[PDB]
Amino acid sequence: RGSMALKRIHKELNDLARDPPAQCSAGPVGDDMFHWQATIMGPNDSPYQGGVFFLTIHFPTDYPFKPPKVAFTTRIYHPNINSNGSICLDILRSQWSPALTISKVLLSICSLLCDPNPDDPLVPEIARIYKTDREKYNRIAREWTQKYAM
Template identity: 60%
Template sequence: VEGKDSLRSSRTNLDICKGEHTMATSSGAPPAGPSRPRVPTPAKDTKPKPTKNNSTSARRLQRELAELTLDPPPNVSAGPKGDNLYEWVSTILGPKGTVYEGGVFFLDISFSTDYPFKPPKLVFKTRIYHCNINSQGHICLDVLKDQWSPALTISKVLLSVTSLLADCNPHDPLVGSIAQQYLSNREEHDKMARQWTKRFAT
């Protein structure tokens, strides 16, 4: 009797499992296979749509590029890398009569889509011995920080950088040791700056 009851119970459980399986597939959908992650369907156009912000910055940059090409600041050239209007490269010739004379200094310039309401980012790619420019090429210059104004242009900024090479500001340094040397031992400072210019910028 116990054997018959066990057999009957097993059949009942089997029928229940069959019923559950039937309910799960009775909607007309095929039985689920191995679960796979659902891959989102790519959008037809993945390019960012133009907005008022970046169209304004693009027009401004195109205008500045045209002006810079026609009337560049002394010893300065600049322009986009390829067809990317927001990434530029610039060269600055070391001003005559300074410790950077004879050097050619390369900079990367990055503009955000908020330009000209946010300043561009300038980074020296050529090493330079200067108290306002650190080893990563970052520049301590007021017009790139709190003195930035949308009325400024990249041409004026590059002119300010050139002026900084001719006349550093040791009282607002990015490299304190070089600023201290400039103030306390100008002769040694100038010697080091000329050596770096000859080594890295010529």
């Protein structure tokens, strides 16, 4: 909160609107600027193609000096995202910089969907299938996009 965070959050939203991310949405849920929602459409040639994924974003009271809290509300079959929707991404913690923006964060997540990090698994078994039988990985990933993201 405080003046500085609110001003930076709103500055981020204006830049995001003036340069609409490719089929990815993000903005405040209602009138509290520290509470955002993002919608991500599955990449075109990924097993997530066709699905729509919703996330919750919570800016810390000291933003940009603290990272935002991001999580999936939509179920997804992925090695770096568990059942609580928790996202295992470095920039969301240790590789966090005040020079980063939510726009960069969304992009970083989009990439995560396209290229998982099986070496840093949040879900062991999904990491395994991915590494040892990627065709199956894609079939199951495609299946969950049907049951949960459409």
